[PDB]
Structure formats: C-alpha cells, structure tokens
Design a protein around this nucleic acid. Structure first.
Lengths: 218, 43, 851
RNA sequence: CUGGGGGGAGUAUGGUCGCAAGGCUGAAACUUAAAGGAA
C-alpha cells in the first residue's frame, strides 16, 4: 500500500521491522496479498496454509477499549474508598493491583472488625478473599510478606495470612509455584514478632504487681 | 528477606514496606517521591 | 531623568480570547491585549475600552509582560464582567462605573473558562492547569477546588449546588458531586483530547480532535456507579480539525433548539436538533423492511436526532462565536476571528428551508485593525501615523484620535516612509514592486512594477526628501529621484550579497547599508566612495541608525546584541548584549544620543549613548515587536508589534511533655465533663424529670480539628518522638499521671484505636507506672484500683489476641513449608550426601569482615 | 674506489646560535551571540 512489505521463509512471513507472524513448521514458497486494498494474505508452507485477516485496525480498537475499562474501574475504587463497602473495593484493588489502597481497605476493614463485636473480617470480605485464585493470592502474599517486615503494619499482614490459611486448602497453597520462597521469607518475621509481643505481655504484669501492692496497702 | 525495590515499573516500593503504585499516587506525592529519590541518590 | 510612559494603545479589536454579547443588533465586549473594549455592532465606534488604572510603563509597573486577557464572561442582569487573564487572575468589574470590584488570583496558569452560577454571587473558573475553582462573590473566597483532571480544562457545565461536569485536554469527561467535591464518574470521551462540551438538559454533546462528535445521555437521578452519564453514539462533521466550542439555544414561539460547533479553521457547523414528534414519526421509516438486524440499525441514532444546518464559513480563521435568536429565522451570530475583525452574521430559516445557499453577514467591524502584523510603522512631523501590512492595509492613523482616517491596498509590504512635506507615502513590497500613495486623493499615484528583481527590504529618504534609496534582496541597491511626483531610477549599485537594510545620515552625508554577509558598509553619498566596512557582528545584521551629529551609529542584528560604532574611524565602542531573541529595530532620539531598540521578544528598551546603561525596560507588548518610529521633534515614540498592537510612548514554642500535659488536661476535662453529663442524664431519667444540666458544649479545638479527645491525645502522643519520650513522660507530675491513666482507661473501650496503637500504649503506660510505682501503690482509692484492673484486663486481652494469630501463623506457615518439603524435596538417605546437598542448597550471604 | 681529526666514558655552563612558555576558544577597536571545551 506504499512502503512496508512482506517477506517469506525464515519459517514465517515477516512485515516491515516488526510483527513476526505465526509461521509454519517448515519452509515456504508463498505470498498472495493482492485482494482489494491489501486484503487476505495467503501464506503457505509445504502443506499448511494461513489466510491472514485484513487491514490491522482491529487490534487498536481492542487496545483502546482496555484503557477505557481501566480508567472506568479506577473511578469505582475511589468511590468505594469514600463510602466503605470494602469487599468489592478489596477485589477490585486486587484486580488493579493498587498496593497502598489494598493496605488501606484491609486496615480500615480490620479496624471496624475490631470495633464491632471463626470470622476476622466481615464475612462477605473473607469469603471474597476465600474465592480468589492462585495469581491473586500469590501477589497478596508477596505484599503480605513485605508488609510483615514492619513492626507497625505486621498485624494486617498476619490476619490476612490467617484468613488465607483458614479459607484455602493447605495442599493447594503448597502446590502454588512461588509460595515456598514467600513463606520462608516471612516465617522468621512472625517469629520475632511473637517473641516481641510475648516479651511485651510478660512485662505487662507490673500492673498486676501494682494491684497486689495496692491491696497490701490496706 | 529485606524489602528491596519493586519488580514492576509502575510501582514504588520503599524499604519501610509501603508499596505505592504510580497510577494510584496523586501528582503531589509523585513530585514528593521524586524529590525524595533525588535526595537518596544525592547521598 | 525625564522618563517615558505609555499614552495610549490601539490597533487591536479582537485578540486571543473569547467574546460576550450584550443585548440592546446589540453591543459586544471583547478583548484587546490585557484590557477589554466594548463595541456597538450597529455603527462600530469604540464606546468603551475598560483598562487597568495603571499605565504600563509607569514607576510601579512590574518587570514582566502584562497579563493578557484570555476569557471574557458577563453577568447580564446584575451587570458584572468577570474577566480572566494569562497569569491566572480574575478581575470582576461593575460595568456601570468600570472599576475593579474583585481580584481572584487563585490559579497557577492561564484560565480557560468562567461561568456565573445561581445567577449572582458564585463564579466557577477553569484553567490551563487542571484545577477548577468555585468562588463566592459575597465572601471574596475560593470556596472549593475540584482537583482531579490532568491537562487543561476545556469546558464544563454546572447546575447550582449539586452537579458539575467538566471535560479536559486529556481524553476525559468527569462528573463532580459538589457536596463532597469528590469526582463521581469518569469516562474517556475521545482518544486524544476532548475540546468541546455543551448540554441541553437531556442530551450532552462533546467533540474531540477530528470530526467525531459524541452524544451522551446524562441521567442525573441515576444510582449506579458507571451510568450517571452514558454514551449514545457518534457522528461526523465536515471539518477534520478541532471543533472547540459547542453551544445551544432554545428559541421560543414553538420550542426549538440549535447548537453550533465552531472549528479550528474558518468554519462553524450549525445544527438544528429536532423534536420528539419527528423522533416518533421518523423511527418507523428507518425501522422499515420487516428484528435483531433492525435493532442493530436502530442502535446505530445520532443522524436521527440531529439535523445539520447552514454551515457558516468566514474569510479568516475563527476564534470565537456566540449568537441570539428570534422567530427561528434570525439566528444572529457574532463571530470574532483571529486576524482582528468581528463579524455579525445572521442566517434565516423559514422553519423548513434555510432560505439561502450561503449565510450573510449583516455587520463587520474591521476598520481599526490590519488583519496581519504591521511590518513597518512611521510617523509624520507629529500628527499622523503610517501602518504597513501584508494584505495591503496601509493605514494612516492619527495620533490625536487613534483612528485610521485613510487606508489603501498595496500588497505584501514590509517597508514604507512618508514624504517630507507630509500627505504622501512611499512604500516597497515583498515582490519586485514599489508604490506611492497620498492622503487627500485616492490610492495610487503610481506603482513601479520591476522596481527590483527580488524582495525589497529597506528604503530611506534623504533629509530633503527628493532622493530615496531602495535596497533589495536581489543583491542590489538603487537610487531614485522625484521628478515633476514620479520616480526616476538613475543609478544602481550591485553588491555581492543580499542587502537588507539601508540608511542615510540625517545630514545627507553617509549611506550605511547592512548586508546579509554579517557586515555593514558605509559609503559617501557624493561619491559612492566606500568609506568604511564595519564587521564582526557574526549573524546577518538588521536595522542601523546614524546619530544627529553624524558621528555615532548603532547596529542591530539577530545576534541578540547591538553594537555602537564611531563613524570617524569605524571603531567600535560597546557591544552591549540586550534582548534575548533578536533586535528587530533600533532608532535614535531627535536631538540626543539616547536611543531605543525594539526586539523580537516583546520588549522595547531605552538606552543612552554615553554611559551605555539601560535607561528603561518597557514591557507592554505581548509578542514580536516588528517596528518602532520616533517623532521628528519632541521625541515621543510609537511601537508596533505582531499582536496587532500599536502603542504610544511619551515623557512623564512548647516541647514534648508540656504539649502532652496540656493535651491531657483539656482531653480529660472534656472526657469527665461528658461523663458527668451522662451521670446527669441517668439521674434525671431515673428520678423526677423536672431538671437536669443544661449543656456541656464541646471544646473549641476538639471540634475545630474534628477529633474525639482520645484521638486528640493519641495523635499528640504519637507526634512526640522516641528520643524524648522517656523525658516527656518523666517531666509530668503524678496528677497528670493519674489523668493519663484515665485516658488509657477510656481508650481501651474504643477497640479500634486501641489495636492500632498497642505497642505505643504499652510502652508509655508501662514506663509511666514503672517510673511512678512508689506513689501509685501508696494512693488509696478504689476508683483507681478498679481503673488499673480494667486497663490490665483489656490490655492483656488485646496482646494475647494478637499473639494468638501470630503463633497460629507461625505453625501454619511452617506446616505449609514442611509439607511442600516432604512432597518434593530430594531423596538422600546417606547423611553425608544429604548434608552436602543441604550445604549446596542453603541461603548464602556474604559479609565484609576485618582481619 | 680520493677527500681525515685524534682516545673511551661522562659532568658543568651568567658565552654564541636556535627551538620552546603564557593562558578557556569564539573575542577585538566591541567585557559581544551561537556553539564547543573543562569541571
């Protein structure tokens, strides 16, 4: 159509460079591209054919349809962060992979879970974290791993690890490829936090010693 | 294990632990994190 | 010193902004540069030029370009004009007394729209930077700042108090809840930019980069997240360029609506929207051939509900428009174009036929402009003024009224001069042509075709005027005499290079000519003697000037510096660097060695030729200053530029510990005040309900920062630092320790901010009672005893509750890792090969040791 | 296809004959552009 051109038989038709096509299994003596403007491109191996589609404008509409989708359901997550209802906020921040908003939805849902009253979040949120697949739970535990390295943000990470452990299958969690380099990374952080909170609760009994002194006062 | 940098490019991962995404940061925090990265490069 | 100033500016009618129309056809407010001028369309005389009260060039004028006006907007009924400028400021004026009422800076870049809302007292403003600010006029305050767009606000539409909807120079349209000031619904309108927005209440219309105009249905009473504003279909226009203003009307007397899309180039596409009766009676006709395919056809609406109309064209590029209507046969549309001109068109329409093959302009205000940049300015003895243009619009303005009284048609004309008796103009054009005009009679005394082989560039009269010099880009200069009132070519000097400036001395002595070959040559007129060659400028060299004593010349160029030369020996004196773009012109005063230089970076500069200081730095233009001309006597100077402007210049501290202590005292005072209020409520609900306490009003700072007292104390306890925390807790006495215990006792009932501050509460509380243990166990009060017991129970319950899930997660995660290991670790029964395998598969880390 | 100063290894040089330094270039009669160098 003016200036880019097709060539054959690397094992494949290639256009001018960009867009290595599917090709074949072996060699090739074939190009017929000569319908209307530049329509159906027949490209043939020894036996197998391909009838390559059309002017390549189909992909751009598909390419321009995702960005519109992502900017649409980015302005649903902000509305959910505004008005609460943290479950679709959770799964949609998992879909967008927005990490500090994920920390915010888990932290404020955890704070209101501490507020009101087996279940550690609201039950619709922990079934929503129960029904998520391997890629989502492995990235969720990637960032539970890196949240667990603090002494401040560790509790949200520990309770997300807890609900994953009690809402998924343990053999499945082991067989997911990648989740043995994560749990090795954040077992010893849980160990030092356990020693620190155990030391804190053992030095918590000066209140009890002060009570028994205050009772021996009279 | 220690929190390095992000394995993506639309993400910013501080050594604190707080991973931020560039699509979710506002422009104020984008300028602020860029200046803070300039300080940590300059030292 | 007797400094300069600006007397008056003119030459502009319509500049780089919009226009608002006022009813009596009617009048029109539009923009000149940095001041607004009102015009009556009927006659066209300048009835008002509302300007700033300070002359640009005075003592307190600040050292930058003045703020160019960029958006006019008018409140009709209460008679206000909200105008907005290039730096971001917004001046609101009363049009009766023409003073400034309101200054509303606010923004950071240029502003792009204004709108009055709820007709008075509220003004919304959108700017180049992506903010959009609401202002009240009874409070002089920016109320709200809607801040989520990304590039530049191209339009919006608001209704009062609840919904705004903006669209910006990214691809995005946004709908704003003005109660919460959070963006509610965001779409991608067009894939590039989004330049248009208009809406008649049901349908919304937007346009983007190229001809794709999108119809939207906004349903304001919707409840779904995506779906307050849906998209209903696209259509096409005839212009492939940026449609950048859309606007609607409802003509009365039946009820009908019309909208226009103005374009980048030259063209406004007008449209009639039809009515629901022809929607209903046109649906079946495209629903013919009788339904999945018919439903797809009915879904694929724009050409259905919208009807194109008379596509109004213009001569020039279109900048802004607005209309009025009666009868649906008087769509009367005013239009300001880029080359400064307003035009009042009006299309008729007999409600079925638009009754014309092409619409008709009923008025045109174009007399006080040029349509191009003035490439040459000139002056009389003192009375008249000469402006030379590219279309042909030579114009003879006058100084004492600023009105063009005489105008002709020449061509691409770049230099001109008067003739020494007055009332006579010589001029040279871009092509090989020269022309002569006068003041009393008509245009052409005579033209000389083939005055030069190529582009003329500069001419100069002699001081008696009988003999003039023309230098042109055909590498020649020529001399002409005036024979009796006609031109006599007699001699011609061909050079090796394209001569582009000439000048003679003011006493018939020298002929200095500036070549393209980086030099000038000074000749004797009486011999063509080649006196001097001044060299070393290092780019091609523009305007020369010879002083009144014929001793000192100036030399301007595109090297951003002017050189002073002494003409007796051709020796340089200064090489002073001005003007960071290009000095287009440089001119002496009449009697002094002071001079002026106007340049290609929108500035003229006043210098002296003795100390070579800069006397003054005059800053009134907006763009490239193409020419300037000084009076022959007296010395007032005019300057004329690329922004179509012509302007005259004449002569004249606690710390941690005590912060925590005062926070503790006000917090616990509020806390036990509310607890006494609650005890009063229980006693007056459990006894004879005849009395109770009146009201404890909450604390000023607590309702000012919007915090419960536990949160207030909790964040100041957070905001002290860990290095001085053991000192902050040691400073405070035991009464503050007791009320700190009351604070902890209240805060571990709100189990939200207990669990988010557990180690801080534990650290502070345990240090406090560990330090104050001797006095605490000697206090005798069962209230504090029960307090300590309650704090102990709730605190230890929270701590064991968090270490429960810590221990759960330890055992669960090591079970997961161990069952993965016994699933597929490896197979070694021999202990030595096993330990070497584990040593090869261990985690290594390398450390820098010292020996 | 005849014509010859005086050893080898060094060292110094207020003599004679040379060659060689400066110091951002542009850039001087001009404290001057662009661009380049250096750090």
């Amino acid at each position: 159509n003016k200036q880019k051109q097709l060539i054959s038989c690397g094992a494949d038709g290639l256009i001018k460079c960009l867009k290595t096509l599917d090709g074949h299994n072996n060699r090739l003596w074939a190009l017929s591209t000569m319908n209307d403007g530049d329509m159906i491109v027949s490209a043939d191996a020894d036996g197998v054919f391909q009838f390559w589609k059309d002017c390549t404008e189909q992909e751009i509409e598909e390419e321009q349809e995702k960005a519109k989708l992502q900017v649409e359901q980015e302005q649903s997550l902000q509305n959910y962060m505004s008005k609460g209802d943290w479950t679709n906020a959770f799964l949609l921040a998992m879909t967008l992979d927005h990490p500090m908003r994920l920390f915010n939805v888990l932290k404020r849902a955890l704070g209101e879970s501490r507020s009101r009253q087996e279940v550690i979040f609201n039950e619709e949120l922990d079934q929503a974290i129960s029904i998520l697949n391997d890629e989502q739970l492995i990235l969720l535990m990637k960032r539970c791993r890196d949240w667990n390295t603090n002494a401040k943000t560790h509790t949200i990470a520990q309770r997300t690890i807890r609900c994953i452990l009690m809402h998924h299958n343990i053999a499945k969690l082991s067989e997911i490829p990648g989740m043995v380099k994560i749990v090795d990374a954040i077992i010893p952080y849980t160990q030092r936090h356990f020693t620190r909170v155990d030391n804190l609760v053992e030095q918590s009994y000066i209140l009890d010693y002060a009570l028994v002194e205050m009772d021996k006062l009279f | 294990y220690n929190v390095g940098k992000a394995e993506k490019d639309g993400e910013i991962r501080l050594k604190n632990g707080v991973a931020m995404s560039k699509e979710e940061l506002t422009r104020e925090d984008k300028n602020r994190l860029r200046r803070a990265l300039k300080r940590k490069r300059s030292k | 010193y007797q400094r300069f100033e600006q007397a008056a500016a003119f030459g502009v009618i319509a500049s780089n902004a919009n226009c608002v129309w006022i009813p009596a056809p009617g009048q029109l407010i539009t923009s000149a540069l940095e001041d607004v001028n009102i015009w009556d369309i009927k006659t066209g005389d300048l009835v008002s030029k509302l300007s700033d009260g300070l002359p640009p060039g005075a003592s307190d004028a600040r050292g930058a370009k003045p703020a160019e006006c960029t958006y006019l907007e008018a409140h009709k009924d209460t008679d206000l004009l909200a105008v907005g400028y290039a730096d971001g400021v917004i001046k609101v004026w009363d049009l009766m007394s023409k003073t400034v009422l309101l200054n509303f800076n606010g923004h950071k870049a240029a502003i792009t729209l204004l709108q009055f809302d709820g007709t008075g007292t509220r003004l919304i403003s959108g700017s180049k930077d992506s903010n959009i600010i609401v202002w009240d006029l009874v409070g002089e305050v920016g109320l709200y700042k809607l801040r989520s767009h990304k590039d530049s606000i191209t339009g919006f539409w608001c209704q009062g108090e609840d919904w705004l909807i903006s669209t910006s120079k990214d691809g995005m349209i946004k709908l704003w809840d003005l109660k919460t000031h959070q963006c509610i619904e965001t779409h991608i309108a067009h894939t590039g930019e989004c330049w248009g927005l208009a809406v008649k209440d049901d349908l919304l219309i937007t346009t983007g980069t190229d001809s794709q105009v999108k119809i939207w249905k906004l349903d304001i009473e919707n409840d779904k997240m995506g779906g307050k504003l849906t998209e209903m279909g696209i259509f096409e226009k005839q212009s492939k360029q940026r449609g950048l203003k859309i606007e609607f009307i409802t003509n009365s007397s039946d009820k009908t609506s019309f909208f226009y899309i103005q374009n980048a180039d030259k063209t406004i596409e007008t449209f009639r929207i039809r009515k629901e009766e022809e929607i209903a009676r046109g649906l079946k006709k495209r629903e013919k051939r009788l339904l999945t395919e018919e439903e797809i056809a009915k879904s694929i609406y724009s050409s259905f509900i919208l009807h194109p109309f008379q596509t109004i064209r213009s001569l020039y590029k279109i900048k802004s428009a607005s209309w009025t209507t009666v009868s649906s046969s008087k769509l009367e549309l005013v239009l300001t174009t880029s080359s400064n001109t307003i035009e009042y068109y009006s299309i008729p329409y007999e409600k079925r036929d638009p009754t014309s093959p092409a619409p008709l302009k009923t008025h045109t205000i174009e007399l006080q402009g040029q349509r191009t940049d003035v490439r040459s300015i000139d002056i009389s003895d003192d009375n008249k003024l000469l402006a030379t243009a590219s279309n042909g619009s030579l114009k003879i303005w006058n100084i004492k009224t600023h009105k063009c009284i005489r105008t002709f048609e020449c061509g691409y004309a770049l230099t001109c001069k008067f003739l020494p008796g007055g009332l006579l103009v010589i001029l040279g054009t871009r092509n090989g042509e020269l022309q002569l005009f006068d003041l009393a009679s008509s245009s052409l005394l005579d033209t000389i075709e083939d005055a030069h082989d190529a582009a003329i560039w500069s001419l100069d009269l002699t001081s008696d005027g009988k003999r003039l010099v023309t230098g042109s880009a055909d590498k020649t200069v020529k001399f002409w005499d005036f024979k009796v009132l006609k031109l006599h070519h007699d001699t011609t000097l061909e050079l090796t290079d394209d001569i582009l400036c000439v000048r003679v001395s003011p006493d018939d002595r020298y002929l200095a000519i500036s070549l393209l070959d980086n030099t000038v040559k000074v000749f004797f007129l009486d011999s063509m003697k080649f006196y001097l060659s001044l060299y070393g400028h290092k780019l091609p060299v523009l305007s020369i000037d010879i002083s009144f004593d014929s001793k000192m010349i100036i030399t301007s160029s595109a090297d951003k510096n002017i050189k002073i030369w002494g003409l007796d020996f051709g020796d340089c004196h200064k090489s002073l660097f001005a003007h960071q773009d290009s000095i287009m012109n440089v001119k002496f005063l009449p009697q002094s060695h002071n001079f002026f230089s106007c340049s290609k970076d929108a500035v003229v500069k006043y210098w002296d030729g003795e100390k070579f200081e800069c006397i003054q730095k005059l800053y009134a233009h907006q763009s490239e200053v193409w020419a300037l001309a000084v009076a022959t006597d007296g010395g007032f100077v005019v300057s004329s530029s690329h922004d179509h402007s012509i302007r005259i210049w004449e002569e004249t501290s606690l710390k941690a510990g005590e912060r925590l202590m005062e926070a503790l005292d006000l917090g616990i005072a509020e806390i036990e005040g509310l607890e006494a209020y609650n005890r009063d409520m229980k006693l007056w609900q459990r006894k004879k309900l005849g009395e109770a306490p009146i009201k404890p009003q909450g604390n000023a700072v607590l309702i000012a920062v919007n915090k419960t007292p536990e949160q207030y104390i909790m964040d100041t306890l957070l905001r002290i630092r860990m290095s001085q925390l053991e000192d902050a807790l040691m400073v405070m006495p035991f009464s503050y320790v007791l009320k700190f215990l009351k604070f902890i006792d209240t805060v571990m009932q709100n189990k939200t901010l207990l669990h988010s501050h557990l180690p801080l509460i534990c650290k502070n509380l345990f240090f406090i009672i560990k330090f104050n243990h001797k006095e605490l166990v000697s206090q005798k009060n069962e209230e504090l005893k029960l307090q300590i017991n309650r704090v102990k129970t709730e605190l230890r319950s929270a701590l064991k509750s968090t270490e429960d899930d810590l221990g759960f997660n330890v055992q669960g995660l090591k079970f997961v890792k161990q069952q993965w290991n016994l699933r597929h670790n490896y197979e070694f029964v021999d202990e030595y090969d096993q330990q070497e395998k584990e040593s090869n598969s261990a985690r290594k880390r390398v450390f820098g040791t010292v020996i």
